[PDB]
């Protein structure tokens, strides 16, 4: 009827970029998830860019838009979700990974070491799988406190209150030569992670990522396999 006469206050904010598609959460001022399709034939190239040349996303309303000022002085890196080095195959592809809508505040040690390693390993799977789908996003995990109750606590940085994830997830969909598809899901804390711990140790059941993140992967995958 006439219920939506004045519109709806919010709807899904999908963004298609050259290198990824993301879903944006204006409450946290960051993406819910970012989706990439890596493959060996559309991976390497001449693209390059300064490691620090990130840009705020003018397609996001200013009330809900993360800025470089939000990160300045916070002690966090602008941690990209869709990695720049996945997309040197075109300058525009690589540039799009520097929208702040594709980054979250990331402990610098993590960004530089164990997360970097995981991104590098993910890229390397294109040498032995036809396609490597990568879905990357934040987590805000509850913890139990000494009063016996459970709470979600996270920092928010800058005037725009950009949320600092407690953890990050990364889901790989590995398309092997002809048909057979394999699923690998990792979680790391937003913390200095020992770079020598084997990445295997950070695998988790996909369902626990689904539960915590509010997202669903397995049903879409079973649906595609039919």
Interaction site with a copy of itself (CB under 8 A): 1-12, 14, 20-21, 23, 25-29, 32-33, 35-37, 61, 63-64, 131, 133, 135, 140, 142, 149-157, 161, 163, 171, 173, 207, 210-211, 213-217, 220-221, 223-224
Phi, psi dihedral angles at 99 (to 5 degrees): -70, 135
Q: Is the dihedral of CA 99, 108, 167, 130 positive or negative?
A: positive
Q: How far is the CB of 198 from a copy of itself (least distance, A)?
A: 26
Residue closer to a copy of itself, measured from CB, 118 or 171: 171
- How many beta carbons lie within 10 A of that of residue 195, not counting itself? 14
Q: How far is the CB of 194 from a copy of itself (least distance, A)?
A: 25
Would you state the structure tokens that stand for residue 155, as one six-digit string? 């920092």
Q: How far is the CB of 94 from a copy of itself (least distance, A)?
A: 16
Dihedral in degrees, nearest 10, Cα atoms 133, 139, 144, 146: 140
Task: Report the b/e string of 129-140 with b at 16+ CB within 10 A.
Answer: bbebbbbbbbbb
For Cl ion, the nearest residue by Cβ is: 85
DSSP 100: G
Binding flag, residue 56, Cl ion (CB under 5 A): yes
Binding flag, residue 85, Cl ion (CB under 5 A): yes
Q: Lay out the site mask for Cl ion across 140-159 (x = CB under 5 A, - = otherwise).
A: --------------xx----
- How many beta carbons lie within 10 A of that of residue 182, not counting itself? 11
Residues that bind Cl ion (CB under 5 A): 3, 55-56, 77-78, 83-85, 154-155, 164, 187, 208
């Amino acid at each position: 009827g006439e219920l939506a006469k004045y519109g709806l206050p919010g709807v899904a904010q999908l963004r298609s970029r050259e290198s990824y598609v993301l879903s944006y959460d204006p409450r946290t001022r960051g993406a819910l998830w970012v989706l990439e399709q890596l493959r060996p034939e559309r991976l390497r190239g001449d693209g390059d860019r300064s490691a620090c040349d990130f840009r705020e996303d003018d397609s996001v309303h200013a009330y809900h838009r993360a800025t470089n000022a939000d990160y300045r002085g916070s002690g966090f890196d602008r941690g990209a979700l869709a990695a720049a080095a996945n997309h040197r195959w075109s300058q525009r592809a690589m540039d799009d990974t520097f929208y702040l809508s594709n980054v979250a505040p990331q402990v610098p040690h993590l960004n530089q070491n164990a997360w970097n390693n995981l991104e590098r390993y993910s890229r390397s799977l294109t040498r032995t799988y036809q396609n490597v789908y990568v879905c990357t996003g934040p987590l805000f995990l509850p913890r139990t406190e000494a009063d016996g109750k459970s709470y979600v606590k996270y920092q928010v940085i800058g005037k725009n209150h950009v949320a600092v994830p407690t953890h990050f997830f990364k889901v790989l969909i590995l398309e092997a030569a002809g048909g057979q598809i394999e699923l690998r899901s990792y979680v790391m804390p937003n913390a200095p992670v020992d770079e020598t711990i084997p990445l295997e140790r950070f695998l988790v059941p996909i369902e626990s990522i689904e539960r915590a993140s509010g997202l669903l992967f397995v049903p879409n995958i079973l649906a595609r396999a039919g």
